Design a protein around this ligand. Sequence first.
Ligand SMILES: Nc1ncnc2c1ncn2[C@H]1C[C@H](O)[C@@H](COP(=O)(O)OP(=O)(O)OP(=O)(O)O)O1
Ligand SMILES: [Ca+2]
Ligand SMILES: [Ca+2]
Ligand SMILES: [Ca+2]
Ligand SMILES: [Ca+2]
Ligand SMILES: [Ca+2]
Length: 901
Amino acid sequence: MKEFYLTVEQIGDSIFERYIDSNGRERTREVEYKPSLFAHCPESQATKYFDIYGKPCTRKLFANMRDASQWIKRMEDIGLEALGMDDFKLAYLSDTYNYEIKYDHTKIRVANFDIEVTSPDGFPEPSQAKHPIDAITHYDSIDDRFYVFDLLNSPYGNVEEWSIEIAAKLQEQGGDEVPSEIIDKIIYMPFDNEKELLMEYLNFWQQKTPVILTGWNVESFAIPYVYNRIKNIFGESTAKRLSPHRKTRVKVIENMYGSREIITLFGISVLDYIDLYKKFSFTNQPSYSLDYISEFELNVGKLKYDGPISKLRESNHQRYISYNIIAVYRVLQIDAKRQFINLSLDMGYYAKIQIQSVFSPIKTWDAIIFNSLKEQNKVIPQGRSHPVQPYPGAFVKEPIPNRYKYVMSFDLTSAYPSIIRQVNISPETIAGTFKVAPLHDYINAVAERPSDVYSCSPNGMMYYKDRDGVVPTEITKVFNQRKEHKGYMLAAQRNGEIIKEALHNPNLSVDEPLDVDYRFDFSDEIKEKIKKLSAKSLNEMLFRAQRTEVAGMTAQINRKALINGLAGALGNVWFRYYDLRNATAITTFGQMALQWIERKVNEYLNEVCGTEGEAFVLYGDTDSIYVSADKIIDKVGESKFRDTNHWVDFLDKFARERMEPAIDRGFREMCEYMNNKQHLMFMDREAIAGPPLGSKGIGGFWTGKKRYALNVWDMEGTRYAEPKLKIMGLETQKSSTPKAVQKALKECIRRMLQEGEESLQEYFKEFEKEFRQLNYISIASVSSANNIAKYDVGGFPGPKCPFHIRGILTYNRAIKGNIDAPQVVEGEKVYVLPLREGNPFGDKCIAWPSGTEITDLIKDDVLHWMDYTVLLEKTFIKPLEGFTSAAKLDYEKKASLFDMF
DNA sequence: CAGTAAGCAGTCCGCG
DNA sequence: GCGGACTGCTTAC
Ligand SMILES: Nc1ncnc2c1ncn2[C@H]1C[C@H](O)[C@@H](COP(=O)(O)OP(=O)(O)OP(=O)(O)O)O1
Ligand SMILES: [Ca+2]
Ligand SMILES: [Ca+2]
Ligand SMILES: [Ca+2]
Ligand SMILES: [Ca+2]
Ligand SMILES: [Ca+2]
């Protein structure tokens, strides 16, 4: 097999590399890597190295990495550019793996661990590590085993051994329901004392040294806790054994407010699953507890126990251990679904970076572009300092707030990356500037043609047409990967809808789910067999289809994020190729394209309908248009349609056979006008939206920019078994809106769009009458809580104190002098409730940590004083009034003359 | 981390 | 009470 790196570090003048050799064995080597850097030189001097602009360079080979770093400094002191890859491990990987990396995940040791620490005096701070580690569960991907290290004797209580037999039993038998599929994979090790536990853990770690290290909050909790506890008991040298090269750094994490402490283990790649989830999941969650995320992702019940966690070990050690094991398994289950570890490996190996660098698109792109340029003996420019400067972004059309009955949407495939490729936007392809006219002159095709030689953006930039830039070249490769995975995602989705249909008529049989590849559209033979399956087999197939769809989503959406991050990186002062000329070339071309095509679509539709001046495009955002199809439907007449699916077909055909050719023609003209390198503006139909045939549903509505709802029948070629709501921006979509409120508002919207005014009034009336019964958590608002200290003035709200911070301060007073009460953590999320006048908390709201029950001390008082009226008005009624006035509907029946009888 | 646009909640305060 | 300036937070792209 081909070799691949596992980890790489620079330590002084050595590269330390862990790798898989040609026999699939793990090895470690220390290499005294001699880096090269580059300086411009005279033309008269023969060389094969040129910078990205074609100026000749001489290579400088250094005796060692420190000489190279010192040289960079002296070049700054002289005032001359020091060219080449200044991150020497990236140069090392590029030299050592000068081919596309084919990796084998089965040879990569992925460790997933979690620790428990009993603490009587509040949260056990990792930087102090003053309490014994009383349990570790460490799952090893190569052994496929959960290694359980269990402390039997502690100053906080001596306990009996954990029982695997009780662990396996149902909770209704008194057991812990540790899933049966892992029972045989548990290797249980009890210990008489913490020192032997930790010594054995370190010996185990030595034998099975993680390459990828993950778990839930491991970076901010488990790793620094284990490190510091070992440090405190044994000394530094012993704690450094967590690093295969015995090197660690205490690293400070700083954004804007405050700072925390993480331990960098040299030669390990830490991918904390919480950070993987935040970067790659594209959710915003009200809470990031593992119980909360597990429930959301896996539909598994909360891990339940009596009393506080600080008393759980002594009261029920059996359950204490079982829950530590389950917690480790839950992260593996989330990963089997979401496949974020697989994604990280793919992207890391593609770029040739440290795997943990996948969190940084700047570092990812820096390395991809470096490897690409190196191939052609080209030399990358030195990174420079730039002051942060604002620059313009997308255009968003102001919609007329209204109901909109029939709507078809279109938007550009991979808009920004496509602009980059079409225009040929790249550091080395800048050809010059032209004299710019106001944007509107380009939109209306009245401005002078920018160039007869170069490819242009309406921001005034011109680009070469003779050859692709490195940015277009590399962005295209990742775009193509994205496209392949999106294809699989969409096929899985369509296949899902086939199964849902079939589920209307399940067969009364005992049979099995078909063995099929859900990434490909089901053949006719598969469809026929599906129509004969039991409900059990169909449901199993649906679950499997949806799992495939999720896997495709992870792979495609994060590749989309990476390429979109390249368009962004051009406006990031930290990027090697930062250039506001290029960042603005992209955004300004986008504004033009949207408004250009708005004009073209309006002109086309006024033509087919025989009108003038009428606005068919009602909305657009960045690269999308929403076209009113009322007139199209009305031209055949609603009476002509057999059912909903019939008009959906008709509009689908109209979009494909009339709209898209017209759109393509308009964009080809724009490409010619801008003299671009390649026409790549592909604006495909997204949504077909409307009310159910013969209903009083309104179909859709807009309240304003980035705020709308549509009843959709077909999304990007997926024809739904049941209509789906596309809601953007409205409160149903915000993590800040109470759970129960999101649900009620969504049902109100469903009724509006599918059923009409009267249905809406029925549901509102019922919701208003019943809502006081809803669980307090389900009706609590949610907010991130930053700068708690800034607004805290002796425990009371300072000037301009935000509502949610006020709540926290209320909470802090209510729990003051309580060591065991959960503390609100700076920068984390809180639930927030309003309080009625004259409550014992002495303020108008309270907040507590999100994803948790409020502490029992005050729970009963919060419940007694919760202001249901304020809650209702602010979270439900106010947004609903916004929706209904926009749609010209009433959520309460108005008096009519019929009332006289 | 460190792409921009733009919505709504809330504070503070004006607005005769 | 609304709205304007402002802070805070959260989406849509
Ligand atoms: N998360 C993001 N980061 C940076 N730029 C973004 C992000 N989301 C959207 N954009 C910018 C770049 C996109 O090309 C453009 C249009 O957004 P959008 O339609 O969501 O994606 P897209 O056009 O790149 O992919 P798709 O093919 O799925 O439509 O807006
Ligand atoms: Ca725990
Ligand atoms: Ca798009
Ligand atoms: Ca599309
Ligand atoms: Ca059937
Ligand atoms: Ca779009």
